[PDB]
Amino acid sequence: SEKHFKYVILGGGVAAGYAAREFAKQGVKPGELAIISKEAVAPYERPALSKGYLFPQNAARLPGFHVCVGSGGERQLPEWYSEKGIELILSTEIVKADLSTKTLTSAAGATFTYEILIIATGSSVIKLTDFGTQGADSNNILYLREIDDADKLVAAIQAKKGGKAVVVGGGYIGLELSAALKINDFDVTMVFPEPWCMPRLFTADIAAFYEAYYTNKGVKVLKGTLAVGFDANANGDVTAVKLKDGKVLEADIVVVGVGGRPLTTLFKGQVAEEKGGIKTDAFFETSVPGVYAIGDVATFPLKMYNELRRVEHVDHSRKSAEQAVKAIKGKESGESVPEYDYLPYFYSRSFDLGWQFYGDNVGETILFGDSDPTSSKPKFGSYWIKDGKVFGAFLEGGSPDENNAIAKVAKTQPPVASIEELKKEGLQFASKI
């Protein structure tokens, strides 16, 4: 009954799917590796859940977006794993991890042993019920982290067709959700307390473009307020959203985007933690030899900024997954592996927009380009200047070359003698580098 594998990746997300591609490249043998996931499907490109998955027509659907298509790689269907002798253990939640005995136990009591462990458990979605919010347990108050959550949302959009939606949260998930609900023909109201949307990255100037663009699209942006409770009917279904300011919004469906946290509960005490995640070295190895932490759960050395960091980027999930397998196989062969040198890269898409950010959002900012929301193809960016150098670069509506140019600016940190002249140059500055 108990199963044994040389390597076990715990989790079936983006990092797990990309670690498995790296294993096949490294020559993994039949029977050696297993991926244990609580989801009923093979690893897939998570960012698709708040994008094409929510389309009313010609939506993204599995098996279409299984990894590694999101980065231009080959689709890894369930057949890809079985045909390689990679054991895909689905619908299995590991409720107990004993690192000292190298044994994991599933919710059904089944046990599994490994020689090497890769922790790719990602993040769990924050819910309003965690806060103890009045009426937050009403039906049709939905979240979006996994494909079952996406399927519940796609069912609710269909059941509540042409109704009222309230989106709680002003991050990029709130933005992508509001845009999705609007392209599905809902009356949409977006609620968040910050003085502008995407507060952890957008400047007031960048936010103003997206707020105006969403307003033109019919989305009602309600900044400076917070959802404090909900009304429900006799079936327990949400009927309204109560706000801190006394306003009461009618709602047929509520979709919440209030963040996430690393899913490291199984390891508390057994591994060193820092900055919310499991601490790793430049090779994603934890304080326990042979136990690795990749993707969302990892607090790793961010080499170019000389500090430990934790990120929630799909690029980091893929790259960190490759780094760990290279470190594991390199130790088997005595081969040296260079340190993880990640350039922070984040992106978001909604409506006909699509932006990319590289580097670090620190220092003084300048906006450049065409930032008119009514333009047929808005193309505008922003630079962050710290210690007289470009530290961060943002671009909306860039071409693949223009996006590569701002990544090279954020990677090389070119000198800025004049911030006024840098704004004059604009996007031409990134191309002339």
> Residue numbers of the site for ligand FAD (CB under 6 A)?
11-16, 36-39, 46-47, 49-50, 93-94, 120-123, 144-145, 263, 266, 295-296, 312-315, 317, 346-348
Cα separation, 169 vs 208, in Å, equals 17
Q: Which single residue brings its beta carbon nearest to ligand NAD?
A: 260
C-alpha gyration radius of the chain: 23
- Residue closer to ligand FAD, measured from CB, 94 or 324: 94
Q: Assess contact for 308 and 348: CB atoms under 8 A.
A: no
Q: Assess contact for 178 and 214: CB atoms under 8 A.
A: yes
Residue 145 touching ligand NAD (CB under 6 A): yes
- Residue closer to ligand FAD, measured from CB, 285 or 315: 315
Contact set for ligand NAD, span 304-333 (CB under 6 A): 312
- Residue closer to ligand FAD, measured from CB, 327 or 366: 327
| Partner in contact with 120, chosen from ligand NAD, ligand FAD, none, beta carbon below 5 to 8 Å by kind | ligand FAD
- Residue closer to ligand NAD, measured from CB, 63 or 229: 229
Q: Which single residue brings its beta carbon nearest to ligand FAD?
A: 13
| Partner in contact with 170, chosen from ligand FAD, ligand NAD, none, beta carbon below 5 to 8 Å by kind | ligand NAD
* The binder of ligand NAD chosen from 137, 149, 187, 194 (CB under 6 A): 194
- Residue closer to ligand FAD, measured from CB, 11 or 301: 11
Both structure tokens of 261 = 């946290």
- Residue closer to ligand NAD, measured from CB, 14 or 168: 168
* The binder of ligand NAD chosen from 28, 67, 168, 395 (CB under 6 A): 168
Stretch that binds ligand NAD, among 36-44, 156-164, 185-193, 298-306 (CB under 6 A): 185-193
- Residue closer to ligand FAD, measured from CB, 135 or 262: 262
Residue 174 touching ligand NAD (CB under 6 A): yes
Contact set for ligand NAD, span 108-137 (CB under 6 A): 123
| Partner in contact with 398, chosen from ligand FAD, ligand NAD, none, beta carbon below 5 to 8 Å by kind | none
Contact set for ligand NAD, span 250-269 (CB under 6 A): 257-260
Residue 227 touching ligand NAD (CB under 6 A): yes
- Letter for the amino acid at 27? G
Residue 193 touching ligand NAD (CB under 6 A): yes
The tally of CA atoms less than 13 A away on the side-chain side of residue 66 is 19
Cα separation, 327 vs 280, in Å, equals 12
Give the binding-site size for ligand NAD (rule: CB under 6 A): 21
Residue 369 touching ligand NAD (CB under 6 A): no
Cα separation, 106 vs 108, in Å, equals 5
Stretch that binds ligand NAD, among 104-112, 164-172, 361-369, 405-413 (CB under 6 A): 164-172
| Partner in contact with 41, chosen from ligand NAD, ligand FAD, none, beta carbon below 5 to 8 Å by kind | none
- Residue closer to ligand NAD, measured from CB, 73 or 260: 260
Peptide bond into 63 cis (omega under 30): yes
Backbone angles phi, psi at 159, to 5 degrees: -65, -40
The residues binding ligand NAD (CB under 6 A) are 123, 145, 168-174, 191-194, 200, 226-227, 257-260, 312
